[PDB]
Design an enzyme around this catalytic site. Structure first.
Site, PDB file in Angstrom:
ATOM      1  N   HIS A  18       0.841   5.028  10.315  1.00 58.21           N
ATOM      2  CA  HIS A  18       0.029   3.911   9.878  1.00 58.21           C
ATOM      3  C   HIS A  18      -0.780   3.335  11.044  1.00 58.21           C
ATOM      4  O   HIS A  18      -0.296   3.206  12.174  1.00 58.21           O
ATOM      5  CB  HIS A  18       0.968   2.886   9.233  1.00 58.21           C
ATOM      6  N   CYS A  68       0.843  -1.185   0.000  1.00 57.24           N
ATOM      7  CA  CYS A  68       0.000   0.000   0.000  1.00 57.24           C
ATOM      8  C   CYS A  68       0.885   1.243   0.000  1.00 57.24           C
ATOM      9  O   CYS A  68       0.659   2.166  -0.785  1.00 57.24           O
ATOM     10  CB  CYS A  68      -0.934   0.067   1.212  1.00 57.24           C
TER      11      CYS A  68
HETATM   12  N1  LIG Z   1      -3.018  -4.873   5.764  1.00 55.31           N
HETATM   13  C1  LIG Z   1      -2.527  -3.926   4.967  1.00 55.31           C
HETATM   14  O1  LIG Z   1      -2.806  -2.728   5.148  1.00 55.31           O
HETATM   15  C2  LIG Z   1      -1.686  -4.330   3.778  1.00 55.31           C
HETATM   16  C3  LIG Z   1      -1.541  -3.531   2.646  1.00 55.31           C
HETATM   17  C4  LIG Z   1      -0.776  -3.969   1.579  1.00 55.31           C
HETATM   18  C5  LIG Z   1      -0.162  -5.201   1.629  1.00 55.31           C
HETATM   19  N2  LIG Z   1      -0.309  -6.008   2.733  1.00 55.31           N
HETATM   20  C6  LIG Z   1       0.304  -7.359   2.763  1.00 55.31           C
HETATM   21  O2  LIG Z   1      -0.736  -8.336   2.561  1.00 55.31           O
HETATM   22  C7  LIG Z   1      -0.315  -9.605   3.134  1.00 55.31           C
HETATM   23  C8  LIG Z   1      -1.373 -10.133   4.078  1.00 55.31           C
HETATM   24  O3  LIG Z   1      -1.653  -9.130   5.099  1.00 55.31           O
HETATM   25  P1  LIG Z   1      -3.049  -9.042   5.899  1.00 55.31           P
HETATM   26  O4  LIG Z   1      -3.155  -7.686   6.546  1.00 55.31           O
HETATM   27  O5  LIG Z   1      -4.182  -9.494   5.020  1.00 55.31           O
HETATM   28  O6  LIG Z   1      -2.739 -10.132   7.051  1.00 55.31           O
HETATM   29  P2  LIG Z   1      -3.707 -11.178   7.779  1.00 55.31           P
HETATM   30  O7  LIG Z   1      -2.956 -11.787   8.943  1.00 55.31           O
HETATM   31  O8  LIG Z   1      -5.039 -10.545   7.997  1.00 55.31           O
HETATM   32  O9  LIG Z   1      -3.864 -12.248   6.597  1.00 55.31           O
HETATM   33  C9  LIG Z   1      -3.137 -13.500   6.657  1.00 55.31           C
HETATM   34  C10 LIG Z   1      -4.105 -14.595   6.311  1.00 55.31           C
HETATM   35  O10 LIG Z   1      -3.368 -15.717   5.775  1.00 55.31           O
HETATM   36  C11 LIG Z   1      -3.844 -16.886   6.383  1.00 55.31           C
HETATM   37  N3  LIG Z   1      -2.779 -17.875   6.315  1.00 55.31           N
HETATM   38  C12 LIG Z   1      -1.773 -18.124   7.217  1.00 55.31           C
HETATM   39  N4  LIG Z   1      -0.969 -19.093   6.842  1.00 55.31           N
HETATM   40  C13 LIG Z   1      -1.478 -19.501   5.616  1.00 55.31           C
HETATM   41  C14 LIG Z   1      -1.087 -20.507   4.712  1.00 55.31           C
HETATM   42  N5  LIG Z   1      -0.043 -21.299   4.918  1.00 55.31           N
HETATM   43  N6  LIG Z   1      -1.808 -20.655   3.574  1.00 55.31           N
HETATM   44  C15 LIG Z   1      -2.862 -19.854   3.386  1.00 55.31           C
HETATM   45  N7  LIG Z   1      -3.335 -18.890   4.173  1.00 55.31           N
HETATM   46  C16 LIG Z   1      -2.592 -18.758   5.282  1.00 55.31           C
HETATM   47  C17 LIG Z   1      -4.301 -16.479   7.782  1.00 55.31           C
HETATM   48  O11 LIG Z   1      -5.182 -17.415   8.376  1.00 55.31           O
HETATM   49  C18 LIG Z   1      -4.958 -15.124   7.479  1.00 55.31           C
HETATM   50  O12 LIG Z   1      -6.331 -15.119   7.080  1.00 55.31           O
HETATM   51  C19 LIG Z   1       1.062  -9.319   3.759  1.00 55.31           C
HETATM   52  O13 LIG Z   1       2.088  -9.562   2.805  1.00 55.31           O
HETATM   53  C20 LIG Z   1       0.980  -7.815   4.065  1.00 55.31           C
HETATM   54  O14 LIG Z   1       2.243  -7.196   4.248  1.00 55.31           O
HETATM   55  C21 LIG Z   1      -1.096  -5.590   3.786  1.00 55.31           C
END
Ligand SMILES: NC(=O)c1ccc[n+]([C@@H]2O[C@H](COP(=O)([O-])OP(=O)(O)OC[C@H]3O[C@@H](n4cnc5c(N)ncnc54)[C@H](O)[C@@H]3O)[C@@H](O)[C@H]2O)c1
Ligand SMILES: NC(=O)c1ccc[n+]([C@@H]2O[C@H](COP(=O)([O-])OP(=O)(O)OC[C@H]3O[C@@H](n4cnc5c(N)ncnc54)[C@H](O)[C@@H]3O)[C@@H](O)[C@H]2O)c1
Ligand SMILES: NC(=O)c1ccc[n+]([C@@H]2O[C@H](COP(=O)([O-])OP(=O)(O)OC[C@H]3O[C@@H](n4cnc5c(N)ncnc54)[C@H](O)[C@@H]3O)[C@@H](O)[C@H]2O)c1
Ligand SMILES: NC(=O)c1ccc[n+]([C@@H]2O[C@H](COP(=O)([O-])OP(=O)(O)OC[C@H]3O[C@@H](n4cnc5c(N)ncnc54)[C@H](O)[C@@H]3O)[C@@H](O)[C@H]2O)c1
Lengths: 341, 341, 341, 341
Positions: B189, B162
């Site tokens: 953030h 993001c």
């Molecule tokens: N949250 C933000 O603002 C944002 C913005 C841009 C990018 N990101 C990136 O997006 C990615 C996910 O972040 P998020 O905020 O959604 O985190 P989150 O913890 O909400 O999402 C992780 C998800 O993956 C699942 N998971 C765990 N191990 C797994 C596996 N082996 N196989 C499949 N699913 C599995 C978990 O149960 C969970 O639902 C990261 O790389 C983060 O840096 C986040």
């Protein structure tokens, strides 16, 4: 010894009184009076119980003698008898009969030269405005930078703001060593007393917004104030403040163009050295991975976080923490102690 | 009509699925599967009830066939049938059967080109790592900047972060008009899923600390990522990120040294014209006194707060908001939609 | 001395060690080892800096001697040398060689009689499970109520929960004085370490939800636990817990039907007398209008808030505060001290 | 039709006007005027941008026709043109001229029968006091319970409080079916606008304390208000309210003694059946594992969480949620609609 009065028994006023009892070194002056528009029972309760700094480690008793209200306050092997007043109009205070050398004006409402003078009219010999100047002052002091320049004719003194007491040393130390062409300040500050709990009518439409819910960018008085202490910085620095949902502690993020070669290593060594010598009373430097709560109840005017120093080309960022309440309170005590006789 | 799968149904994944339904533009591709280590009942519950974005405005049916599990989702007059998987090892996923054209890798755990390739092994044609690259990628993309630089041969793509998706446009727009000598980023953030509720053991000793109680300075992947998207800015950009106790929404504070004459008016005028022409898809500009909440559920990659623009000498600071969950999710869908023939 | 070890250096384990150092009167046993899955630099960092309880007022130095890792901790005129382990499987810990007399089991993962016996296999002579019994224990103990019931042969002991150590005294005192027909408990509790920062998959769909954003009703282990400590109260008491966005401190709201005449005055008088006589070690009563943060870092098992007491007919509500972390931790040390003495 | 005015454009006033636009049911009356002490620009800003309920999905245009200020509001296919006033004293307001049938008195300041009549003096036919009564009223109304009992000659009506409108239905239904001997209420409530950001002088020493940091027990007006609607319950019911750091949404926990046999099953069946028949306008029941944020922007007066229902002997506890802002606002609109008969 000198006789200090506190006008406005708020975050700052209360913490000033608390910091007096807590200081490891006893101060060579007394606080003999306080004044607030709130009644004494409310003030004693807030003095004794604090959401940020915890319970006052001491005892407070209210007495009525003649027709006057006193607090007897005992802690850390010290006792103060402090008269309590309830007068919204500073000119009507009894500073003359109480032989007040120094009023700490901590209400936020009497920052103008004229308004501050009301205490003088009431017969106090000197006011410290616990805020940035509004129009004019005899002097704008950052303890540890220019408290030695106070002259006996300085009757209206501004002790500036939390932010200024941190920004001014950083700017000075760095400009002195490497030279600053220009700089821009981002402050990240805990919520303040003048913010809102929920979205509510307010003079400022950003500070109207729910404080526990929002990131709120707003103005800072610290730049105007810094320019009164260092006029040579006029047109060379600006910045703003951001309120976020923490209860206490703030940070300053200063971005500057240097006039001579810089590295992260040299900036940090300079600031460490500054902290060990000339600025040891007010400044610390850490290299540990800490967060805001680690500096709550810290008396320093600033604690540089050396792990955040960054350089690209001629541009650098430094980062310092401060307890915006306890630092400032301690600096008001320090400042009063510096008046000596 | 392409077939997208989502791996990791967390803040980003769920929001991708929601954003597909809520978009006023109907996308061409369909989302046809999701995978997570949590069971479908947990998944559907969290899809429906969101502390940040509210209740899902539509209908979710869970269907169990002898073997397979499907969600039937109806909202805004759109319908998807979405196979649900529960496989921790992405190589064991049935993307071949499912004829998956693009997997959105939203777990945070498979950013290396090696790990991303596990999905290629399981039968997917293309992977978009929904994060900054950990090492190699065929392309690092910021939608609305270099999305056309995707080659039909590219298989492992990164949509960066993001933060990157807001940083890059600013840096690009300003560099093209005035020239950027250097710049330093401060991101403020909201808390993220990986932080701690209370002080707890963690790989990062700053993110170990209570997220609701602290201002927490930490690293940003955005700078490494920006180098990949714009290698002409190598060693010219650095920055960091500060976590504070809000639930969602972020702001970037970018301080740069210009190479040609700048004023507040000129910078703002440029950013406005950019938002109205070349970047109208991902960018807006406001002068209203807003705060973080007002951008919750905003689909923009950035919203410039023009009232915050500052100039001192050759140095300037600009400020932009973004919904870190909703903007990114929209940008993932926008990217998938760019691959269409 | 007697030799204690802590298994799991979290909120509880870390506070046990701190509490050892801060107790005005020195405990006559030593903590000689801690074990956790996190590395020692993470442990020492979290031990020193605490978002809730502040900085540790002392010095910690890590040493390697043999192939063994030691913490040398100095605070309050006291010194401990504490071996650090990192063994996820308790049967494998070196308790035989360390001549451990008691293990404090503070991980939350080894509550069954079988899991806890693994420490005995490793050669420890006794275990206190710092949680509610899971299946069976030799004794379930509330310090100050029935710790004298511990038999020399008892080897697996539960110190129940924080909630239980507050509820049990209240019920016992009121039941012994007025008789309780039935009672229902509502606990309002700060967030705990097992909750979520954002909406996230979780075994419990309410504790899935963003802990800083929500009121979250959940279950309590205290009702089962109270049943073990006071069997006569089977089928007479139930209740539940609500998590709210504070960082520490909880309250019990207990509504009971009395079996004899009650008034607000008589209930408060009783509770006061009890706190001054039989329950002085673990109980206090306040009459001031206080809030949660006023009990942060309080060692009491409960502080009755006599201003909250209400009666309507035969029904009554009482209300007590406790620092869920600091109280419990002090009670663990008190319990250990009881075996010696 | 019928002409309404809002005195006080705060949390309630603003949400009443929003709720008007958003209601699925179109109301057979118009809001034609608002008054606040704040200027129109602040008011329109806070109407459009809300930290709790989000952005108003509509457009607002300010015009000046004659010397009168107006808001042209459009949302959800509906329109209003509302005159804006800025008069600190109600008797001065132009209700006679504007032909006001009903004033919604939402300042919190004119709750006395006398202060309220100032509006009738101003030419309004009827006032609803949007709060518990101070002294006397012609009628204390809970919509959906006793609104049929309004007389065409009633002129000073109280719509009680949010809490009252959840408590009264619960008490009535249970007392009607099973008989309530006595009952005690614990409300768990989001912060409200009269609370403090930091520890600050306040009439209420508890509400003085920092609202984001603390669990804060305080008084509730709902017991007095309920005794005005149901005088039979005098001396039979009491309770209080606990403020916790959430922005919106509250819960009632009602502990009661039944006068006839009860089980969980029977209490739940009763409340369900009530919600489906005579209380369908104001009441719902859920067994889903939900948390506070799931009821944000819910129009119900109460949503029973049937999973929370407990029984021990003759004593039971029930639990219900409500959006303390959006519920009350809708009930205000519903009460006004009831007056068309
Ligand atoms: N949250 C933000 O603002 C944002 C913005 C841009 C990018 N990101 C990136 O997006 C990615 C996910 O972040 P998020 O905020 O959604 O985190 P989150 O913890 O909400 O999402 C992780 C998800 O993956 C699942 N998971 C765990 N191990 C797994 C596996 N082996 N196989 C499949 N699913 C599995 C978990 O149960 C969970 O639902 C990261 O790389 C983060 O840096 C986040
Ligand atoms: N809190 C900080 O971090 C910080 C740091 C530096 C400077 N300051 C400055 O300190 C000042 C006070 O801020 P605060 O946080 O203590 O606020 P506060 O609201 O807690 O303090 C205001 C106090 O003044 C009292 N008061 C109001 N009108 C009065 C009158 N006419 N006469 C007497 N007493 C009156 C109020 O009852 C209250 O006790 C402001 O100017 C602020 O900028 C604050
Ligand atoms: N915190 C409270 O308010 C409170 C009060 C009373 C009782 N309790 C109970 O105490 C227990 C601990 O809770 P907490 O709040 O300290 O949680 P926490 O998550 O802060 O502590 C758990 C610790 O155990 C460590 N650990 C994990 N696996 C381990 C293993 N295999 N071997 C050794 N260490 C391991 C973790 O790294 C962490 O340091 C729970 O049973 C909890 O219910 C907590
Ligand atoms: N918000 C709730 O959850 C809730 C629910 C039920 C009842 N109430 C009651 O409603 C009342 C108002 O509460 P709120 O939350 O809307 O408060 P608020 O503080 O948000 O709103 C009060 C408004 O009144 C305005 N005002 C002040 N003096 C005025 C005057 N003389 N003339 C005109 N406007 C004036 C203020 O500027 C402000 O806009 C209180 O009695 C409260 O207890 C609140």
């Amino acid at each position: 010894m000198q006789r200090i009065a506190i006008n406005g028994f708020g975050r700052i006023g209360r913490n000033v009184l608390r910091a007096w009892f807590e200081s490891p070194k006893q101060f060579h002056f007394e606080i003999v009076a306080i004044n607030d528009i709130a009644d004494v029972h409310t003030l004693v309760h807030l003095f004794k119980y604090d959401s940020t700094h915890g319970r006052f480690n001491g005892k407070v008793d209210i007495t009525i003698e003649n027709e006057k209200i006193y607090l007897n306050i005992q802690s850390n092997q010290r006792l103060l008898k402090v008269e309590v007043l309830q007068q919204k109009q500073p000119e009507l205070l009894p500073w003359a009969s109480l032989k007040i050398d120094v009023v700490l004006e901590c209400t936020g409402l009497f920052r103008s030269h004229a308004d501050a003078t009301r205490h003088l009219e009431a017969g106090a010999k000197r006011v410290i405005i616990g805020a940035a100047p509004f129009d004019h002052v005899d002097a704008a002091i950052v303890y540890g930078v220019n408290h030695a320049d106070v002259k006996a004719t300085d009757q209206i003194i501004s002790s500036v703001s939390c932010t200024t007491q941190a920004l001014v040393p950083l700017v000075k130390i760095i400009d002195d060593a490497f030279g600053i062409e220009t700089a821009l300040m981002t402050e990240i500050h805990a919520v303040t007393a003048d913010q809102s709990v929920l979205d509510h009518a307010h003079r400022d439409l950003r500070r109207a917004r729910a404080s526990g819910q929002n990131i709120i960018p707003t103005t800072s008085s610290a730049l105007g104030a810094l320019k009164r202490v260092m006029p040579k910085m006029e047109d060379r620095i600006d910045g703003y403040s951001i309120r976020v949902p923490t209860i206490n502690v703030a940070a300053i993020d200063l971005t500057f163009i240097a006039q001579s070669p810089i590295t992260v290593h040299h900036i940090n060594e300079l600031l460490i050295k500054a902290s060990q010598t000339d600025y040891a009373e007010i400044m610390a430097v850490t290299d540990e991975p800490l967060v805001s709560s680690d500096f709550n109840h810290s008396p320093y005017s600033l604690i540089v976080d050396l792990t955040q120093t960054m350089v690209v080309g001629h541009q650098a960022k430094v980062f310092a923490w401060y307890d915006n309440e306890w630092g400032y309170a301690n600096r008001l005590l320090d400042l009063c102690d510096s008046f000596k006789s």
